[PDB]
Amino acid sequence: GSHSMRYFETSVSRPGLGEPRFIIVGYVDDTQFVRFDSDAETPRMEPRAPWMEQEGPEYWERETQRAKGNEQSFHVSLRTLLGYYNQSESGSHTIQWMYGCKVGSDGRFLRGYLQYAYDGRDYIALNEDLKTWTAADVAAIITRRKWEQAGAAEYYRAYLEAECVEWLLRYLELGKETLLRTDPPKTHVTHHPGEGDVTLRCWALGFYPADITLTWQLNGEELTQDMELVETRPAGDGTFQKWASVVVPLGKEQNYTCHVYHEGLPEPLTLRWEP
């Protein structure tokens, strides 16, 4: 612990060309474990993690049928939102749904989440209480009123608090040999000269999970300003990478230290350029 399971369902309309594209991607923490793709020759939910491959034909048949029902559900939703916004039948639009549940170190139910987007923007979201809804616009108010009558929050709450948590614990057991690992960052400071200044670049490689913090310090104080930083990128082997650079005066490299924060580290790392 702590661990979470997240599903990402997306449907994109393609008027004229054919039917909308429907994709599902499932994650246990930062590891993808399932995928569904309507554009595949024989569309079915498939494993994306070799520890998921153990799951039998009854599991895959059940998840394929669930995926195919959602695909049709979002095909109707796309046509419904077209009437809410009074949009034309010739345009491409997207619906995104992301939902999940977080478990603790125990692991018992911590947090649950469920929300939608239309054309890249918030549409409707389930509140932290898993009981009430937050509509983002006047169209989302129509959906909220309909779902309040149908008791949609109660149906989803049961899943998020119970069904979601028991399946995440099963996948955590199936994939324990790798899912329960914390690969600590492999760090090094590179030096690059320039107006008589030097670029110091603190690297963090081979870490898992993705959540990391890289900071530069000068005499106990963090250099928030004039600090370049890249987005955490996947190495493609299950680990992540990140770097943070600073521009310091030539020959003063020993005064700057890079501080690394990762759950895989008992204490934060401290490193500098090594001549």
Binding site: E9, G26, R62, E63, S73, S77, T80, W147
Partner: peptide, 8 residues
């Protein structure tokens, strides 16, 4: 496993 979507 995931959940069944309720129509918007």
């Amino acid at each position: 496993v995931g959940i069944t979507n309720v129509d918007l």
